[PDB]
Design a protein around this nucleic acid. Structure first.
Ligand code: GGB
Ligand code: GGB
Ligand code: GGB
Ligand code: GGB
Ligand code: GGB
Ligand code: GGB
Lengths: 154, 149, 154, 154, 149, 149
DNA sequence: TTGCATAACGATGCAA
DNA sequence: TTGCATCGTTATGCAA
DNA sequence: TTGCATAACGATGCAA
DNA sequence: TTGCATCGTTATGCAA
DNA sequence: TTGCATAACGATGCAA
DNA sequence: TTGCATCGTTATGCAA
């Protein structure tokens, strides 16, 4: 199935050097498993696979971090956001496509900045006031779902 | 902090926020390093005479109490490790730098500490001007911030 | 009916010391009137009844203010908001779940703060720019309804 | 048809001095063309016709600018906005009734101010954070349509 | 104010706001204490040469006029009772405190008064720095604010 | 600028914005006067070792590079024509005025230039306070700004 | 004095 | 509008 | 000069 | 697109 | 070194 | 969930 294909992908990547998704499709094909690039795109996105390279390092090869870090540049953005939510998030709420977050006075800009830097797929953008942040959910995510996601980190 | 200090913080918290529940109050307290349970907050609010106030057709209510602050500078010192990138000075001004967006948060904590050598603060986005009370200089203020770290 | 039940409630409260809604249900029952706690919750909310107590005052008893004040702490939040709307609100408008309020330059924060402090049931939160405030309506209230409510006070 | 009626209107205005739409209806009637005030309102709005007058100049007469300026006061609110969008707009996006615009750090207020001053018919209002602007679309315009309009100027 | 002063305010108002109607203009004027009816505003705007301007497919239009201010300091003094919590100073700075969020509003009114002894202002959320023009000191500025109350 | 300078700007740009595409990077660069095509940016980002980073279920990614600035003051000088309405001073402060809303944008560019004679800046809405490093005076700073125009 | 576990209490979406 | 069922919110007996 | 009351004027949701 | 009906917005005769 | 044109590559709305 | 078809995004051979 899917989770089996993905296990094979984490394996094929750590052992080989895949530079493209079509390339990973052929690597899976010779191994019996047949998938399209479309699906691998989805898998790698779920896997958190990142096309890596060093300075002057040309086209990268895919690699999934083992909760080990992306060298130097943390990913990291999300963990930092989670820490600041735990510290600064006072309440969450929602209406339509909006999650509304409250913070202590003056803290909204700092928390919103942390959320922007996490670059969440379901967030179109944020605006901070002084103690309130409007977070715009990317369709079809609702404000209520976005809010629940923030709540779970509160 | 202890009962009396925590309750002073609570009064401060309730005047600047709109607190709908003891759970919210706990989150506001935890933001300044104070961690207590809902049972304690129930007791604090009773001792304080705090009431969950609402008008006509007014929903569920918010807590208010009828009519410096303890740990004030410790709340401020607490944030310096996180939010103080650097200090500097010129004449009667200390100039503090913070991560992007953090200036108002740290400046608010400086204000609440109500230091007698500080006339006031203004925050931009990543910079705070702290105005020294004569004859204290900006340099001394900066030194105070560096020492509270 | 309802308004009759409520008249009795304003009466039962000023004469007795009701510490719970179930208690007010029994006080109404012995008086013939049968209601559930659910309805009393709604009535007290409409009535603006507040569970009052002094310092170290234990569990409160319900009391409805007679446009007399809630001692020291004004309610009060609403009147102040209404005054600042009259003074600072330049225009109201709406879209979807949003009321959009305009103020003179620089006044938006101050007006938004007043609205937050009123803690209106139909407002999820506010964000102030410099001369514009976005007010997020709590479902099912629409932005247009919220805006009309602010208009009425303009 | 319509574009023919409008060509006649640009003509009737530059040659005569029309002080009201009902007046422009009679001027078109004597010329065969029959329309209501409602339609002329729509035409003049599309035409960009403006009721002009000088200081102490009483009731104005309609005039459509020939990309020549409205004397002194630029109409140019729009041109200025277009210039600043070209300079400052980093990306556009949308959700529901919202267009979300991103700018370099610190530029959001300045760009949002420019958009306000353009007073676009399909914009209810704007709020600026530091690098993000929420633009509220006036129903029935969607956020996506608003965003595309800004994209076109990016 | 009278005709000439009110019309000066109107010009100032029309350049910083986007005014779609005379009703809006009345609300903007009422915010700075000036109360007149729509009839008077119709007449003011005519005397001013103000036009309701719009481009192509441009909607209903906003008022603009082609090409200190009267009562400027009175508009500022007007707000002090409301918005001035306290004044203080240090060197060339006066430090004003306001209710939460009110700093930009009061600072804007200070700016419009264009006092010759004031180089400029910066507002945070509840604090304004007013920069004194040499050799005026912050203390004298603070005294001026206290006296205008 | 040339390869090395442009790439320095890119590093600065990538740390303060969340850049999802080379197209976005081009818009950010164009905002500070640098115009290059996507092909060049592809090459810049490769030379920089920049990676399009994302976590688990993390969407499409944003560019980051592992681990003052060239043309810094020219970026600042660039904006003065647009954004500097006037300069003035008092003691250790230069006071800059900008069009409404522009203060943060110009102050950010001043900060990035990192002038040794400038301790820091605070922006309001239309005013910037630039704090002079002793013994430089606010007047000299103002003169520097007027000369960079 | 506090936390814990639980009881008492108040609010609310849904169907009628 | 209400009641029902249920859930979020607040109070409190007991151990430490 | 201003407010009041009202008339003149322009804009707009709805059906066709 | 247009017209109808209507409403929000702006101009103006008269009393003071 | 860069731009241009184009190829290679990755993401995604829709139907199944 | 997947594949298809397609589109937005990124890489690269060649002229200058
Ligand atoms: N500005 C202060 N002190 N409070 O007002 C905040 C208003 C609004 N919730 C906002 O966050 O924009
Ligand atoms: N606004 C952004 N992102 N940066 O600019 C900050 C300018 C200035 N140091 C201040 O803190 O006001
Ligand atoms: N910042 C100035 N001066 N005006 O711009 C305001 C932009 C936007 N309406 C806002 O209120 O955020
Ligand atoms: N304040 C800084 N430096 N960044 O935070 C931005 C938060 C949010 N996108 C906003 O524009 O309000
Ligand atoms: N932002 C809030 N809520 N308070 O902080 C204000 C800090 C400082 N006095 C200033 O007015 O900038
Ligand atoms: N906020 C507006 N619209 N004006 O007020 C500006 C006040 C002050 N000069 C500052 O720039 O902070």
């Amino acid at each position: 199935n899917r989770a089996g294909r993905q296990a094979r992908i984490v394996a094929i990547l750590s052992s080989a050097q895949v530079r493209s998704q079509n390339e990973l499709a052929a690597l899976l094909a010779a191994e019996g498993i047949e998938v399209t690039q479309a699906t691998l795109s989805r898998d790698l996105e779920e896997l958190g696979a990142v096309k890596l390279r060093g300075a002057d390092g040309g086209t990268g090869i895919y690699v999934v971090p083992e909760d080990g870090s992306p060298v130097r540049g943390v990913s990291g953005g999300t963990d930092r956001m989670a820490r600041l939510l735990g510290e600064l998030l006072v309440s969450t709420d929602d209406s339509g496509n909006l999650a509304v977050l409250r913070t202590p006075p003056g803290a909204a800009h700092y928390l919103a900045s942390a959320i922007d830097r996490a670059a969440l797929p379901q967030v179109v953008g944020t605006i901070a006031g002084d103690d309130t942040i409007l977070v715009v959910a990317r369709e079809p995510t609702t404000g209520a779902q976005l809010a629940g996601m923030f709540e779970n980190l509160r």
